[PDB]
């Protein structure tokens, strides 16, 4: 679907009123055709996707809005879908060429500090500017008041535009200030390349640089280019999110480039003396980051990956590499932020229909599509993998489930098979398939600052984004002609990640890498300070403050949550430690709390609840000092998108 104009905010000796020009049906049809002929009028449009409504503001002949609302979508237009003229993920800013009829606001120059924000309800909220991109509300408002107003203008008294509203800054759910994208970031954006060539690995600079490398897998970004640098005499570390991929580089590089490299993973180390080393991010973090003077070049492969181990790992590289004598960090990926999936010449993509014997996410798979050959079906959950593999086995189709916690030997590697997998596949197993059948959904964790009493870390199912679709689809088509079958053409915006992943970084710092909360922050700051990598909200101080108060964890409980391999081992074992020491029960008896089972006979009363990591079945008390500490941390300024 295209983004679709559904109304406009008409400005005036500053007043505002709204007009709605389209209902739900109009909006849906136009989104799908991308053809919109209605008259366009005004500086501020009210726009909508199928999932969301927000604002867009025309400036210098460009219709600007927020990346978090529009992603990389086309805008419905009179001559059809209008491709974005500008996509600046780093600034949460996108732009379309304004169609005829749209009027622009002119940049505010005088440089006033009394500002006015125009909401989707056509209120005019006075704001006092502070920095380049922040303004304090004269009258604090509940945050819900600003939702749907992303993209709306911040105006000076003359009525010229300072920027566009992008996010509220909250204290316990009350918007005290607002974050905006200034008009100078728009101008900068208007002068950036039509297409920057990033497909060429850079030459080694005289002094430290950070370079991007955008190219497909099979391009040789992780094999050909390290070899080339090695031939020139450089030492080079290659970092990858997958244990299986990393191990795979050793036999491949020996055979293909006559280099038997150093290989480093949690489960296996090989030191050959070679000038090229492949390592996982996790093992790099375990080894303590950059070895003094060891490498000239660090290639951060699959740098689009937004698991916490990758984020902290790259952040560590960016904080440590220059000081460690390296000359060149390369952030390499085939799918950078803002990317969209395009047709692949070697992959035929066919939508599932309802015809077929095997039900699948509301559609159907014909048995003939999978009866023989080697096929991969991506499901969002363990449980769905188990049920579908059972169904297929019951029909006598050779089928196996793969997900985190299973050994990869469940395979086979050769012969007919239907592999029914989660995304754990993309790191546990390197092979390709004759076809991929994709549910087009995934599980992700999201933080909710729920104040009940503190925060909640929630597991949710969401539509895949352009990175998930392209990486799932890419398990077919490499050196064979492939087929990609799908439930829905949907595709969320690529390149953004949740604050709960930042929380996981501090968790893993504490649990695995002996990092103090403050050292994790330094490394993440270096990542946050780096354009062209995936984007998140700036919640470093908030999470640092939470983990800073979590002292004297019980070593034993921690070792058990680590061994068990589930998410947030530090927060889980830290809750367990509070419970055990207060002689009180855990929030429930789900397997998350199993390190406490031996104490079940003696644990009683309400749970000293710190935070919510699942269902809370027991009664809760709020009297524990740590709970009070974590509640005070909730008063921190928090960016939240509107």
Ligand X SMILES: CC[C@@H]([NH2+][C@@H](C)CC(=O)NCC[NH3+])c1ccc(Cl)c(Oc2ccccc2)c1F
Mind telling me the catalytic residues? 68, 92, 150
Token code pair at residue 146: 């600003």
Residue 604 marked as a ligand binder: no
Residue nearest to ligand X (CB): 535
| Residue 308 C-beta-side C-alpha neighbours within 13 Å | 21
Burial of 25 from C-beta contacts in 10 A (0-12 / 13-18 / 19+) = exposed
Cα(553)–Cα(517) distance, integer angstroms: 14
Print the binding letters for residues 526-545 with ligand X: x by CB under 6 A, - otherwise. -xx-xx-x-xxxx-------
| 144 DSSP assignment | G
Shortest distance (Å) from residue 335 CB to ligand X: 14
Q: Does 386 bind ligand X (CB under 6 A)?
A: no
Interior angle at CA 493, CA 492 and CA 499, nearest 5: 100
Residue 18 site contact among ligand X, a second copy, none (CB < 5 to 8 Å, cut-off depends on kind)? a second copy
Residue 354 site contact among a second copy, ligand X, none (CB < 5 to 8 Å, cut-off depends on kind)? a second copy
Shortest distance (Å) from residue 64 CB to ligand X: 13
Shortest distance (Å) from residue 160 CB to ligand X: 22
67 or 145: whose CB is closer to ligand X? Answer: 67
All residues at 6 or more sequence positions from 287 whose CB lies less than 8 Å from its CB, including other chains: 264, 279
Burial of 422 from C-beta contacts in 10 A (0-12 / 13-18 / 19+) = buried
Shortest distance (Å) from residue 607 CB to a second copy: 11
Print the binding letters for residues 83-112 with ligand X: x by CB under 6 A, - otherwise. ------xxxx--------------------
Crossing angle between the packed helical segments 540-548 and 625-633, to the nearest 10 degrees: 170
CA 264 to chain centre: 26
83 or 450: whose CB is closer to a second copy? Answer: 450
Residue 160 marked as a ligand binder: yes
1 or 241: whose CB is closer to a second copy? Answer: 1
137 or 230: whose CB is closer to a second copy? Answer: 137
145 or 497: whose CB is closer to ligand X? Answer: 497
Residue 141 site contact among a second copy, ligand X, none (CB < 5 to 8 Å, cut-off depends on kind)? a second copy
Cα(533)–Cα(530) distance, integer angstroms: 6
Shortest distance (Å) from residue 245 CB to a second copy: 34
Buried b (16+ CB within 10 A) or exposed e, 180-208: bbbbebbeebbeeeeeeebeebeeeeeee
Token code pair at residue 264: 């480093």
| 290 DSSP assignment | S
Cα(77)–Cα(2) distance, integer angstroms: 9
Q: To the nearest 10°, the Cα dihedral for 261, 264, 267, 270?
A: 40
Residue 579 marked as a ligand binder: no
Residue 488 marked as a ligand binder: no
Residue 92 site contact among a second copy, ligand X, none (CB < 5 to 8 Å, cut-off depends on kind)? ligand X
Closest by Cα among 322, 326, 323, 303 to 313: 303
Residue 108 marked as a ligand binder: yes
Bridge partners of residue 180, in order along the sequence: 165
Q: Does 445 bind ligand X (CB under 6 A)?
A: no
379 or 447: whose CB is closer to ligand X? Answer: 447
Chain contacts with a second copy (rule: CB under 8 A):
7, 10, 17-21, 24-25, 28-29, 32, 50, 140-142, 172-174, 354, 359, 362-364, 450-453, 614-617, 619-620, 622-623, 631, 635
10 or 324: whose CB is closer to a second copy? Answer: 10
Question: Do the Cβ atoms of 75 and 2 come closer than 8 Å?
Answer: yes
Question: Do the Cβ atoms of 39 and 101 come closer than 8 Å?
Answer: yes
Total of chain residues touching ligand X, rule CB under 6 A: 18
Shortest distance (Å) from residue 535 CB to ligand X: 3
Residue 173 marked as a ligand binder: no
Residue 220 marked as a ligand binder: yes
Shortest distance (Å) from residue 527 CB to ligand X: 6
Shortest distance (Å) from residue 362 CB to a second copy: 3
Neighbours of 624 (CB within 10 A): 18
Tell me the torsion sign for CA atoms 336, 475, 458, 405. Answer: negative
Closest by Cα among 118, 335, 298, 120 to 209: 298
Residue 221 marked as a ligand binder: yes
Residue 451 site contact among ligand X, a second copy, none (CB < 5 to 8 Å, cut-off depends on kind)? a second copy
Residue 53 site contact among ligand X, a second copy, none (CB < 5 to 8 Å, cut-off depends on kind)? none
Residues 468-527 that bind ligand X (CB under 6 A): 496-497, 527
246 or 499: whose CB is closer to ligand X? Answer: 499
Cα(117)–Cα(127) distance, integer angstroms: 7
Q: In sequence order, what DSSP letters do the residues of 397-422 get, joined into one string?
A: --EEEE-TTS-GGGS-SSSSEEEEE-
431 or 614: whose CB is closer to a second copy? Answer: 614
Q: Which of 67, 180, 486, 506 binds ligand X (CB under 6 A)?
A: 67
Q: Does 180 bind ligand X (CB under 6 A)?
A: no
Bridge partners of residue 276, in order along the sequence: 236
Crossing angle between the packed helical segments 555-564 and 499-512, to the nearest 10 degrees: 120
Residue 533 site contact among a second copy, ligand X, none (CB < 5 to 8 Å, cut-off depends on kind)? ligand X
Q: Does 51 bind ligand X (CB under 6 A)?
A: no
Residue 91 site contact among ligand X, a second copy, none (CB < 5 to 8 Å, cut-off depends on kind)? ligand X
Shortest distance (Å) from residue 7 CB to a second copy: 6
Task: Give Cα separations from 453 to 148, 382, 447, 622 (angstroms).
Answer: 27, 30, 14, 8
Bridge partners of residue 441, in order along the sequence: 463
Residue 505 marked as a ligand binder: no
Question: Do the Cβ atoms of 569 and 511 come closer than 8 Å?
Answer: yes
Annotated binding site for Mg(2+): which residue ranges?
222, 302
Annotated binding site: which residue ranges?
108, 110, 156, 160, 215-222, 302
Annotated binding site for Zn(2+): which residue ranges?
108, 110, 156, 160
Residues of this chain that interact with ligand X (CB under 6 A) are 67-68, 89-92, 496-497, 527-528, 530-531, 533, 535-538, 641
């Amino acid at each position: 679907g295209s983004v679709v104009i559904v109304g406009r905010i008409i400005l005036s000796s500053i007043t505002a009123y709204s007009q709605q020009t389209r209902g739900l049906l109009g909006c849906i049809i136009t989104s799908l055709t991308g053809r919109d002929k209605n008259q366009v009028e005004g500086e501020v449009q009210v726009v909508s996707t199928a999932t969301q409504s927000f604002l867009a503001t025309c400036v210098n002949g460009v219709c600007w809005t927020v990346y978090h609302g529009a992603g990389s979508k086309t805008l419905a237009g009179p001559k059809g879908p209008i491709t974005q003229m500008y996509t600046n993920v780093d600034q949460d800013l996108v732009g379309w060429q304004a169609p005829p009829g749209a009027r622009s606001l002119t940049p505010c120059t005088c440089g006033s500090s009394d500002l006015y924000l125009v909401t989707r309800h056509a209120d005019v909220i006075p704001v006092r500017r502070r920095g380049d991109s922040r303004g304090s509300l004269l009258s604090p408002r509940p945050v819900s008041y600003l939702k749907g107003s992303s993209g709306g203008p911040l105006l000076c008294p003359s009525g010229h535009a300072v920027g566009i509203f992008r996010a509220a800054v909250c204290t316990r759910g009350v918007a005290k200030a607002v974050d905006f994208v200034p008009v100078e970031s728009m101008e900068t954006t208007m002068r950036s390349p039509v297409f920057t060539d990033n497909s060429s690995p850079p030459a080694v600079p005289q002094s430290f640089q950070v370079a991007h490398l955008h190219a497909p897998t099979g391009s040789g970004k992780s094999t050909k280019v390290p070899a080339a640098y090695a031939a020139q005499g450089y030492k080079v570390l290659v970092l990858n999110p997958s244990v299986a991929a990393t191990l795979g580089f050793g036999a491949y590089m020996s055979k293909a480039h006559g280099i038997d490299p150093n290989i480093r993973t949690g489960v296996r180390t090989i030191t050959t003396g070679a000038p090229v080393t492949y390592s996982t991010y996790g093992k790099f973090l375990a080894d303590g980051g950059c070895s003094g003077g060891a490498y000239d070049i660090i290639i951060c492969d699959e740098c689009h990956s937004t698991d916490s181990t990758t984020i902290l790992g790259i952040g560590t590289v960016l904080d440590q590499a220059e000081t460690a004598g390296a000359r060149l960090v390369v952030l390499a990926t085939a799918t950078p932020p803002g990317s969209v999936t395009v047709p692949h010449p070697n992959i035929e993509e066919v939508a599932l229909s309802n015809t077929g014997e095997i039900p699948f996410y509301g559609k159907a798979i014909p048995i003939e599509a999978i009866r023989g050959g080697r096929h991969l079906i991506f499901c969002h959950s363990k449980k769905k993998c188990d049920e579908l593999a059972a169904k297929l086995s019951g029909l006598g189709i050779n089928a196996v489930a793969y997900y985190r916690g299973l050994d990869v030997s469940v395979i086979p590697t050769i012969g007919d098979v239907v592999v029914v997998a989660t995304d754990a596949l993309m790191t546990g197993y390197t092979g390709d398939f004759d076809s991929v059948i994709d549910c087009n959904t995934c599980v992700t964790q999201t933080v909710d600052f729920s104040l009940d009493p503190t925060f909640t870390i929630e597991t949710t199912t969401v539509p895949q984004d352009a990175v998930s679709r392209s990486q799932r689809r890419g398990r077919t088509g490499r050196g064979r002609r492939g087929i990609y079958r799908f439930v829905t053409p949907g595709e969320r915006p690529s390149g953004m990640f949740d604050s709960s992943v930042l929380c996981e970084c501090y968790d893993a710092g504490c649990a695995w890498y002996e990092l103090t909360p403050a050292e994790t922050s330094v490394r993440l700051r270096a990542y946050l300070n780096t354009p062209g990598l995936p984007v998140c909200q700036d919640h470093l101080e908030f999470w640092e403050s939470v983990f800073t108060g979590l002292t004297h964890i019980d070593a034993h409980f921690l070792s058990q949550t680590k061994q068990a391999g589930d998410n947030f081992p530090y927060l889980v074992a830290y809750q367990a430690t509070v419970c055990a020491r207060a002689q009180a029960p855990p929030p429930s008896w789900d397997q998350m709390w199993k390190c406490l089972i031996r104490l079940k006979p003696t644990l009683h009363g309400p749970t000293p609840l710190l935070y919510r990591l699942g269902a809370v079945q027991n009664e809760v008390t709020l009297t524990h000092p740590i709970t009070k500490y974590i509640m005070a941390c909730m008063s921190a300024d928090l960016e939240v998108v509107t």
